[PDB]
Amino acid sequence: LDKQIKEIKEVIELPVKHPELFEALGIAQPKGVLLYGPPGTGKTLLARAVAHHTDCTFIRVSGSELVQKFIGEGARMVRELFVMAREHAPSIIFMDE
Amino acid sequence: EGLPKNPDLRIAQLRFLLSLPEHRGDAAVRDELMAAVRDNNMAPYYEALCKSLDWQIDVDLLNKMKKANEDELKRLDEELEDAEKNLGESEIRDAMMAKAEYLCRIGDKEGALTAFRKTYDKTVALGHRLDIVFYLLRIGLFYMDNDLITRNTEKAKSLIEEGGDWDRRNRLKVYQGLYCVAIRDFKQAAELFLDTVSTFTSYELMDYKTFVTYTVYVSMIALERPDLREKVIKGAEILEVLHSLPAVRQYLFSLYECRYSVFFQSLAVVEQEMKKDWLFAPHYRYYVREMRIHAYSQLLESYRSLTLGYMAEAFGVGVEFIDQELSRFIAAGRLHCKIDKVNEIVETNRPDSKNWQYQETIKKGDLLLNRVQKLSRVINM
Amino acid sequence: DVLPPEADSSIMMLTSDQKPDVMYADIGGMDIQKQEVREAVELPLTHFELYKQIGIDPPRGVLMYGPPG
Amino acid sequence: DDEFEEFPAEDWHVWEDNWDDDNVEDDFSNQLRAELEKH
Amino acid sequence: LRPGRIDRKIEFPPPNEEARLDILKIHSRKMNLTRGINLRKIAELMPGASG
Ligand SMILES: Nc1ncnc2c1ncn2[C@@H]1O[C@H](COP(=O)(O)OP(=O)(O)O)[C@@H](O)[C@H]1O
Numbered sequence: 001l002d003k004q005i006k007e008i009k010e011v012i013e014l015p016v017k018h019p020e021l022f023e024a025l026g027i028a029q030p031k032g033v034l035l036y037g038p039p040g041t042g043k044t045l046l047a048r049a050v051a052h053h054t055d056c057t058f059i060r061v062s063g064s065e066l067v068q069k070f071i072g073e074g075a076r077m078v079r080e081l082f083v084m085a086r087e088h089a090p091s092i093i094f095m096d097e
Numbered sequence: 098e099g100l101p102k103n104p105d106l107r108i109a110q111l112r113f114l115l116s117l118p119e120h121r122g123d124a125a126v127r128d129e130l131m132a133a134v135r136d137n138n139m140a141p142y143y144e145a146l147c148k149s150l151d152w153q154i155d156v157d158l159l160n161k162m163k164k165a166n167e168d169e170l171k172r173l174d175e176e177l178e179d180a181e182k183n184l185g186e187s188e189i190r191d192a193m194m195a196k197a198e199y200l201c202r203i204g205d206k207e208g209a210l211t212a213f214r215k216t217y218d219k220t221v222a223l224g225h226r227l228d229i230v231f232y233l234l235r236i237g238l239f240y241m242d243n244d245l246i247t248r249n250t251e252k253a254k255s256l257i258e259e260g261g262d263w264d265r266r267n268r269l270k271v272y273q274g275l276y277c278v279a280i281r282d283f284k285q286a287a288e289l290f291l292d293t294v295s296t297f298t299s300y301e302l303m304d305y306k307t308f309v310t311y312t313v314y315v316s317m318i319a320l321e322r323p324d325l326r327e328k329v330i331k332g333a334e335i336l337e338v339l340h341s342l343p344a345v346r347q348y349l350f351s352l353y354e355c356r357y358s359v360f361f362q363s364l365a366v367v368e369q370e371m372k373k374d375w376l377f378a379p380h381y382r383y384y385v386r387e388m389r390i391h392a393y394s395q396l397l398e399s400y401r402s403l404t405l406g407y408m409a410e411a412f413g414v415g416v417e418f419i420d421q422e423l424s425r426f427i428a429a430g431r432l433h434c435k436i437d438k439v440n441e442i443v444e445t446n447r448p449d450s451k452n453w454q455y456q457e458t459i460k461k462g463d464l465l466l467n468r469v470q471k472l473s474r475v476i477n478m
Numbered sequence: 479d480v481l482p483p484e485a486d487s488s489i490m491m492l493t494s495d496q497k498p499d500v501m502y503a504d505i506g507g508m509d510i511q512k513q514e515v516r517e518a519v520e521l522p523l524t525h526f527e528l529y530k531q532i533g534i535d536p537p538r539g540v541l542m543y544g545p546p547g
Numbered sequence: 548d549d550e551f552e553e554f555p556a557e558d559w560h561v562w563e564d565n566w567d568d569d570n571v572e573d574d575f576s577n578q579l580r581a582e583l584e585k586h
Numbered sequence: 587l588r589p590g591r592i593d594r595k596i597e598f599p600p601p602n603e604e605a606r607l608d609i610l611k612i613h614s615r616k617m618n619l620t621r622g623i624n625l626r627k628i629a630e631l632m633p634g635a636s637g
Binding site for chain 5: 224260261265267295298305334
């Protein structure tokens with residue numbers, strides 16, 4: 001999946017490494033990626049690979065209560081992960097269905 | 098398929114041939130080397146080779162190759178800068194790895210090494226790091242840089258340990274066996290070659306025919322009779338490739354089943370090709386001596402006494418020649434017998450292995466004690 | 479002080495007496511499950527060298543899930 | 548430190564270094580060929 | 587799905603024959619493969635399979 005590597009590279013790598021190409025173009029930096037595909041076709045694989053190569057902190061969100069104390073003890077809201085994401089920015093928050 | 102033949106070892110083979118005194122002037126070897134040089138635009142390597150071999154520099158060809166190389170380097174530096182500015186880390190790495198690859202393809206050792214070090218610094222993939230390390234190892238084989246070889250071998254082992262790429266582990270086994278053959282470590286060369294005989298894929302170094310030839314040679318000179326029987330004489334892949342090979346199969350099987358004097362024509366022909374080969378060249382005398390000693394020991398082991406006449410008849414050689422050879426080896430201490438000359442007869446004996454182990458211990462301890470004492474003088478004062 | 483790593487509340491079974499009396503002969507059937515459990519827990523405990531040599535990574539944990547009984 | 552100029556000077560392999568490869572002798576191929584020819 | 591949120595939607599379909607061959611090569615790099623295995627043949631034999 002090389003064309004897919006290329007697209008994810010654009011939308012993830014370029015905004016965080018070269019936030020000047022988008023400024024010159026005059027378009028807001030992309031901030032949302034969604035990966036179609038049957039199970040085990042490389043979605044999580046490519047997300048992790050792009051995060052690793054870009055040096056972004058890959059934060060996997062799954063809703064498990066086993067990690068709710070790590071997110072925040074009184075986690076009545078899912079946006080409380082954003083403090084962690086900001087602290088470890090640049091960050092890539094990955095959800096899987 | 099194998100890794101790319103960027104530092105083509107065939108070029109090193111041809112250079113070694115042209116360095117030999119019976120081929121310093123070989124028209125075919127020179128023409129093929131020049132074909133490779135003009136096809137790969139080896140301008141720096143061509144200049145260095147002309148200097149070393151005293152040839153006359155073909156100024157026109159050298160200038161055209163130099164212009165081609167300069168154009169390529171300029172274009173590829175432009176690509177690298179474009180990747181720096183616009184594209185991302187992967188594109189940067191690809192461009193600068195291509196620069197290192199071309200610096201190899203034009204035989205520029207130092208520039209290629211520096212480019213590879215920079216690429217390894219800027220690379221994040223373990224497999225790509227292993228590719229760079231194998232590039233460096235092939236450069237080390239090409240230029241017989243022992244320090245480079247050992248450093249990159251340790252680096253490759255460390256990189257493989259994590260990741261556990263068995264394909265890369267087998268490739269490193271082949272490379273390390275080649276290095277062991279180069280440095281005359283035939284025991285480890287045979288061990289690695291027998292490990293990787295059924296999984297050989299490194300065609301960047303040499304063909305499977307040559308690989309099996311080297312494996313058979315090192316196995317004969319290193320392994321004992323039981324191990325040789327189990328590995329070489331019965332390995333299915335070795336037997337098939339030896340069916341393809343008419344000569345080395347005869348050599349190995351003659352040694353194994355005691356057909357003597359045919360072992361010696363085989364040893365003569367293999368010695369000639371060993372001398373021709375760049376990898377085995379500064380060990381052919383040692384290999385032949387060791388193989389002759391092995392044959393004599395094999396013949397003498399199963400007999401309390403054996404007339405020099407019978408020895409000569411078995412080996413096809415004359416009595417005087419076999420007597421002098423046997424006496425030389427006995428004086429060297431690598432044969433467990435003595436020879437009575439008034440009535441020619443070779444009488445064997447069985448010295449306990451404790452004596453051999455004591456002699457080896459004294460020798461190795463003397464080497465290490467000399468090293469330790471040298472270190473002591475270096476430090477204390 | 480540092481104690482020997484044998485301080486523990488969960489003691490091994492005294493194989494002399496606590497060992498169960500069941501056998502693969504007493505089980506019967508379920509050969510697929512028996513073979514999977516073998517290759518997961520028993521073979522790698524005496525052939526881990528073979529596993530590493532052929533390139534497999536032995537697993538720890540098998541979970542034996544399924545209906546009751 | 549000292550260059551040891553008292554004495555004049557004359558203008559000027561990781562394997563085990565053994566004194567057996569030094570023997571002056573024709574290739575074993577040549578030796579065997581001679582032995583067979585005179586045989 | 588509102589056309590203002592997902593800045594990009596990539597598609598990872600089931601691997602082609604070539605993609606399956608590439609995946610097989612990558613995942614077999616880490617084992618003793620006897621010399622001369624037709625990974626292309628294996629990929630062809632397993633159609634409609636994921637990585
Ligand atoms: N395109 C691919 N190339 C190599 N391996 C793949 C690919 N797609 C999937 N895999 C393998 O499949 C396994 C599971 O993939 P996964 O990342 O879970 O995909 P998904 O996120 O779509 O479920 C991984 O171990 C991975 O090595």
